[PDB]
Design a binder for these strands. Structure first.
Ligand SMILES: [Mg+2]
Ligand SMILES: [Mg+2]
Ligand SMILES: [Zn+2]
Lengths: 60, 128, 204, 80, 146, 113, 99
RNA sequence: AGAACCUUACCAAAUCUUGACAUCCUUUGACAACUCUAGAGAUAGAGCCUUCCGGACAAAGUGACAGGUGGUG
RNA sequence: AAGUUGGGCACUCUAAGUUGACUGCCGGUGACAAACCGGAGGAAGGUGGGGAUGACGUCAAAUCAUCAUGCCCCUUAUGAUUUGGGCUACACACGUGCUACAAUGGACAAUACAAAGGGCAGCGAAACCGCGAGGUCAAGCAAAUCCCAUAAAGUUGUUCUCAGUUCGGAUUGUAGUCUGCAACUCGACUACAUGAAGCUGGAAUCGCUAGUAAUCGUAGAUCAGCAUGCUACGGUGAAUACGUUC
């Protein structure tokens, strides 16, 4: 994301509906997970590094 | 008492079966088997162990069954009745085993695979 | 094409670097951890840090730093570690406790090797020699196997390429095997060069 | 607002502009960016210059137009 | 590119008529796993056949299948007449019975199935025609039997 | 014959009433309930007193020409006022915001490759 | 008057060792303890696209599984209450005591 | 893995040029959550008026500098 | 009323630790081999089912729009802010889906059986009101407790009776509900009316070897609202595989 866009997301909007989530690590607009506040790419990177508590590869 | 107890599991259904001297009446969840289960074919399945051991009419079956559906619950009973029959007489194993009643059916629902529409079904492919 | 070795074995043979339980504030705690980890990396660049383990309990952050050079981080009178702690305390409202663990063998550590090879490449060291010296030193230390790779415009070449060297055994497919993997980047004038190190120390 | 409990939606600036114009018979054009505003009975006889995204297009309210939005009477896309 | 033959699944006898074949017929009639509707159609058809025939439903059904099942069939290799296996014979008989019943004009499946089973017992159904046609084309290719 | 329409005699009156414009399944069930005429009775087996009872109720509902005329005027109004919906009625394109890159065949008619 | 302890952790080894400790301390204080009864594990599965751009069909699945243990202190004794609060468990485990 | 605004980038109109955003430097202390007016809003002008620990943090000006989902996979 | 409580932990289940499958044992075959076939026992037999895990390389294959980065370019503008519009266009062509073309069905009524998930200012019961979508009040519940949430197909009746229909449900009118700052462009859902094509699909072409295909519902992420998509879940549950010329 552009620095201005990240800034604008952080600023309080005129309306609540206008507020949107971005990835806190990189600012990616799409595919942001609520629990971790991370996009799909960032979540994967941190899970691999063992830096997300409790999260491991799933097999069944 | 003279109660013989066996547990049968089929698919996601489990049945707790109690075999007691009786007329051959089957009661499932405090309801008649014929009321409980839709088809008479299902009844033939659960009475199969009795036929193999020739113990038909000797026992009244009281069943507490949970999970799955009518077929699973019915075939869950078959496994439980056979397991109870073994408790009643160890001699019956040969007959029950030969029929394959003793085996628990390991077949279960296969998970959906990511990138597939189902466990095995694939999206319609078009070259070009 | 290849899974991250750490990622595959995390939660199987390797424990999570982060060791805390949260539900409502999981996102907040994670992001606080991320800012701390970033700060430490920049603060202790000179010091050789393999990894940082963070434990959160009783509104207190417990930080375990594994460093090749313990003296640099701690400071002569423990001043440097206190300074780091105070800086961390400004960042995080919770009290921060820092523990410094020395690494006996820097060469057996993948991150330290990867960072070293990257730093040498930035100094215009030959890509081939740097990998070869790294594998030799690790094998002398008794590592069962080591793999080292450098990728990019290795010699300032217009076309990028990846060269790798290996010694002993690195069983990536074996889940039991504990393999230390790290990637580092060399910011060369020609471009970014990526260095990956796989180290199999072996069972005990 | 579609729900009846909430009244028809009008932007205050639009409504106030019309209400000021009530006094004089010789009405003047009202420039608006409010495509979303409902056309009230009061609006009858007024010409609203509603923005189409590039230009304000003259829209003159008639009795039938009441209950429809101002945006409905100014197109945003052009075809053939 | 195949390892070998795979063991076939087995069916319990039909409760009402005590025939394995009856169970297999239900399986061919069944659509989308809806066993009950299939069983319902078959049992009702067997009632209608007995009612009209005045003979045991299983008897006429057995007589019907015997007429439909084919001894010889052509296989592309020139088409060569080949002996249908006993298990294949049943598959073709049941498949043809149900398929040709579905093509009959009666409003309900049960009536169509009963008319077909009755006709096949008299050796006059569309399924019977299918066997006859199969046998004809096999005889035409008798020279290629070798 | 009800509301100027000769409804099918053979069918049950619940269904037969729906062959009138402005009357569907829901309305037909209401009108029979008000008239206290059975749904099951076929129109051929309907009685004159019953028919009159039904006719009273159907007179209550706007139907056939009355409804057709109303619907047309609403659409004509939209077209006259130059509403977005009205313009799409004129153009024969989807009026209720459906996409037109594909489909829209019911409104656009058959394909004109 | 049963003191209930609920334990939740992402790893079972930590939860089990913590469970043993809390049970022991209370039993040492002489309070009767029933458990540690194992509550059904909770697993949250996250499915993400592996690639950065396109390639929908390739997916990676991750799971976070919470292991739950229930411990009940049948008899409350002054020593037990203080000891249970006093016990320091590993950082991972989360303990909730209802008295 | 959620385009009515937002997202959003693209277009049109209305606007700004140390800048929406960072660090430093000089100066000051409240910086404003608030109300009212004109504005489509951005915003501007009137109100006020509260808060601040060597020394915190936040404003004003200017320059070092910022900004780019611009290009090249 | 009811596992509802009194009680019990039998059972079931939950989940930790262990036992079990290794060609181990026994027949033949085979090179004194590896293997092979068959059998015994066993819940399971020959890597039991499924998953994760993808060698050296290939396509200068994708991504400078996640991010980062060499170089290049812009910098009172290729940066920045706001309102509105667009990304939703529509003579057409294609891919992937959804729903149908009915009687193995439609409608109506009565009556059973799951699994796997989600929830804090969130899930929201019961009750009352509305035809309904919903509204009002409000219990419980940070979870094996409460709530989402009654699975549906199914089973048993009643009715329709082979036609563009009591099939199908597009479209359009009108009157509403809800979310939201605001549903005009451009939301979802409801009620009433309306009632298109469609009669099983040319050339051609796709998936699947068993708890699979087919079919039926269920849940989740994203998310104010918004799913015929995606990812999971169980219920019912087949047909066929001679064989390797093509
Ligand atoms: Mg490339
Ligand atoms: Mg688009
Ligand atoms: Zn990110």
């Amino acid at each position: 994301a552009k620095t201005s866009m990240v800034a604008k997301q952080q600023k309080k909007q005129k309306y609540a509906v206008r507020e949107y989530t971005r990835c806190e690590r990189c600012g990616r607009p799409h595919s942001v997970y609520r629990k971790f506040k991370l996009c799909r790419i960032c979540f994967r990177e941190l899970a691999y590094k063992g830096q997300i508590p409790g999260v491991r590869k799933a097999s069944w | 008492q003279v109660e013989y107890r066996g547990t049968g599991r089929r698919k996601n259904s489990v049945a707790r079966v109690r075999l007691v001297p009786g007329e051959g009446n089957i009661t499932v969840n405090n309801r008649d088997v014929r009321e409980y289960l839709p088809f008479e074919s299902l009844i033939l399945d659960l009475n199969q162990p009795f036929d193999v051991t020739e113990t038909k009419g000797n026992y009244d079956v009281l069943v507490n069954v949970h999970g799955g559906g009518f077929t699973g619950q019915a075939q869950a009973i078959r496994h439980g009745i056979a397991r109870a029959l073994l408790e009643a007489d160890p001699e019956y194993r040969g007959s029950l085993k030969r029929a394959g009643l003793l085996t628990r059916d390991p077949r279960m629902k296969e998970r959906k695979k990511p990138g597939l529409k189902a466990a095995r079904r694939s999206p319609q492919f078009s070259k070009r | 094409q290849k899974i991250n070795p750490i990622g595959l074995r995390v939660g199987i043979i390797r424990d999570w670097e982060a060791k805390w339980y949260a539900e409502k504030d999981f996102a907040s705690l994670l992001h606080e951890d991320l800012k701390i980890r970033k700060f430490i990396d920049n603060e202790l660049k000179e010091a050789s840090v393999s990894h940082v383990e963070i434990e959160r309990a009783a509104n207190r952050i417990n930080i375990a730093i594994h460093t090749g050079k313990p003296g640099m981080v701690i400071g002569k009178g423990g001043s440097e570690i206190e300074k780091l702690r105070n800086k961390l305390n400004a960042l995080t409202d919770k009290k921060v406790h820092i523990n410094v663990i020395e690494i006996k063998k820097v060469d057996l550590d993948a991150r330290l090797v990867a960072e070293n090879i990257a730093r040498q490449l930035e100094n215009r060291a030959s890509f081939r020699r740097v990998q070869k010296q790294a594998i030799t030193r690790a094998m002398k230390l008794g590592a069962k196997g080591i793999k080292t790779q450098v990728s990019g415009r290795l010699g300032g070449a217009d076309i990028a390429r990846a060269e790798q060297y290996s010694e002993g055994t690195v069983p990536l497919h074996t889940l039991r095997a504990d393999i230390d993997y790290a990637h580092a980047e060399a910011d060369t004038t020609y471009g970014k060069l990526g260095v990956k190190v796989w180290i199999y120390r072996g069972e005990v | 607002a579609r729900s009846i409990k909430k009244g028809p939606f009008v932007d205050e600036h639009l409504m106030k502009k019309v209400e000021a114009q009530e006094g004089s018979e010789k009405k003047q054009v009202i420039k608006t960016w409010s495509r979303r505003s409902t056309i009230f009975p009061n609006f009858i006889g007024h010409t609203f210059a509603v923005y189409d995204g590039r230009k304000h297009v003259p829209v003159y309210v008639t009795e039938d137009m009441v209950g429809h939005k101002l945006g409905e009477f100014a197109p945003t896309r052009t075809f053939k | 590119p195949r390892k070998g033959s795979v063991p076939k699944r087995d069916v319990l006898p039909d409760p009402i008529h005590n025939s394995k074949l009856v169970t297999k017929l239900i399986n061919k009639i069944m659509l989308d796993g809806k066993r009950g509707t299939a069983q319902r159609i078959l049992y009702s058809a067997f009632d209608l056949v007995e009612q009209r025939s005045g003979r045991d439903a299983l008897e006429v059904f057995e007589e019907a299948i015997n007429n439909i099942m084919p001894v010889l069939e052509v296989k592309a290799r020139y088409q060569v007449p080949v002996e249908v296996r006993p298990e294949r014979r049943t598959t073709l008989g049941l498949r043809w019975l149900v398929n040709y019943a579905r093509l009959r004009g009666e409003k309900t499946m049960e009536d169509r199935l009963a008319n077909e089973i009755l006709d096949a017992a008299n050796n006059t159904g569309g399924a019977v025609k299918k066997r006859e046609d199969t046998h004809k084309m096999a005889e035409a290719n008798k020279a290629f039997a070798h | 014959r009800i509301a100027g329409v000769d409804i099918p005699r053979e069918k049950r009156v619940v269904i037969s009433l729906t062959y009138i414009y402005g009357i569907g399944t829901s309305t037909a069930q209401k009108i029979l309930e008000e008239a206290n005429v059975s749904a099951d009775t076929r129109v051929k087996d309907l009685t004159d007193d019953e028919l009159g009872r039904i006719r009273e109720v159907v007179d209550g509902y706007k139907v056939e020409g009355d409804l057709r005329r109303e619907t047309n005027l609403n659409i004509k109004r939209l077209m006259e006022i130059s509403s977005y919906r009205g313009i799409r009625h004129r153009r024969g394109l989807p009026v209720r915001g459906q996409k037109t890159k594909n489909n829209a065949r019911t409104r656009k008619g058959p394909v004109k490759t | 008057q049963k003191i209930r302890i609920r334990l939740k952790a992402y790893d079972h080894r930590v939860i089990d060792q913590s469970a043993e400790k809390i049970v022991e301390t209370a039993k040492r204080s002489g309070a009767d303890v029933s458990g540690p009864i194992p509550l059904p594990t909770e697993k949250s599965v996250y499915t993400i696209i592996r690639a950065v751009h396109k390639y929908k069909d390739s997916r990676e699945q991750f799971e976070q599984r919470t292991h739950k243990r229930l411990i009940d202190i049948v008899n409350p004794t002054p020593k037990t209450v203080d000891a249970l609060m006093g016990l320091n468990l590993p950082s991972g485990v989360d303990i909730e005591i209802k008295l």
